[PDB]
């Protein structure tokens with residue numbers, strides 16, 4: 001059972017707490033779309049772990065490649081190259097949009113945003129970075145300085161030149177022009193304020209194509225293209241953080257392919273390592289050449305390590321071979337219709353949004369007031385777990401609690417239906 005007194009005593013005595021509370025269970029095994037507690041109880045993993053298990057837990061082909069490289073080619077001096085590294089780098093150049101040619105293989109998402117941000121500052125000779133007011137890019141220095149949904153207080157000054165603009169949010173619009181939500185005019189208004197505050201050192205704008213921690217906020221039609229033009233006019237680079245949206249989760253290989261807008265630097269992580277610590281940035285040949293002439297440095301212990309790279313290549317091989325980008329649309333649509341069915345039954349569901357298998361459900365007290373419910377939101381999440389469904393709700397000021405639903409891309413029809421059923425039962429008993 002989950003009550004092991006010795007486990008919990010050691011946990012309380014020896015763990016640094018880092019946000020949230022720990023779930024009251026001991027996970028002993030994981031397979032496919034499920035994790036199992038000490039009693040052997042199956043829990044449907046509707047968040048793919050910490051949004052990384054795109055192939056589900058312990059996929060046989062990942063188990064296979066891991067064992068193979070762990071026993072043959074593992075870690076190396078960082079100036080030594082190997083085939084998994086050049087192959088993965090090449091595959092990323094071939095599957096990302098034209099204009100993205102060279103890759104750097106790292107370990108974590110924050111680390112990949114750090115590498116991108118440093119490169120932008122170096123090639124522009126400038127340092128101000130602009131992000132969204134509801135963003136999340138990581139816990140490390142520069143990634144945290146551009147993170148506005150949380151973490152800015154009690155820890156001293158942010159990086160010099162940190163600015164934010166509001167994200168375009170169609171469910172809670174606050175910028176009206178001629179009776180309607182003019183998010184493009186909101187963008188122009190925001191950039192004029194940025195321009196006046198700036199010291200003339202704008203280096204880049206960093207953006208999630210769908211803000212996850214921020215409440216599953218999807219950038220609307222024409223917005224990303226207009227953002228890119230704001231950057232081009234100011235000699236700024238556009239960096240797109242696809243930690244959560246990359247590698248097929250939203251129904252295209254990369255979310256930026258939907259708008260057809262190619263960023264100057266693309267960052268990847270979670271979904272690329274499928275559970276393992278692998279991350280990357282990809283940029284153009286012109287930007288990389290200039291960064292190299294200027295002495296670009298990002299030398300770490302695990303950059304270009306063969307085992308992590310072999311795993312990422314295998315992840316891509318499987319996603320491509322098994323058509324998992326298409327499955328995200330088929331299972332994504334099945335899940336979204338089920339969520340809309342629940343919305344028909346329960347007045348507390350104020351909105352169902354997102355794309356592919358990155359969906360959000362916002363809980364509200366009043367559908368006309370859109371007044372947040374959240375106390376209710378946490379309750380539903382609690383009931384879901386009791387029922388064997390792992391969910392995650394995010395809460396930001398002026399918004400209802402929002403469930404972030406992101407099942408493995410390998411999830412089955414039966415699994416989607418089980419999740420939908422448990423959710424409905426959780427809402428019924430939370431009310």
Ligand SMILES: Cc1ncc(COP(=O)(O)O)c(CN)c1O
Pocket residue numbers: 108109110111113136137138139208212213241242243244269
């Ligand atoms: C969009 C986004 N970017 C970057 C990160 C940071 O990744 P990591 O925690 O692996 O450093 C996160 C957190 N999952 C994220 O959601």
Ligand SMILES: [K+]
Pocket residue numbers: 075076077078079300301302303304305
């Ligand atoms: K290395």
Ligand code: NA
Pocket residue numbers: 092093094095096097098099100101
């Ligand atoms: Na490319």
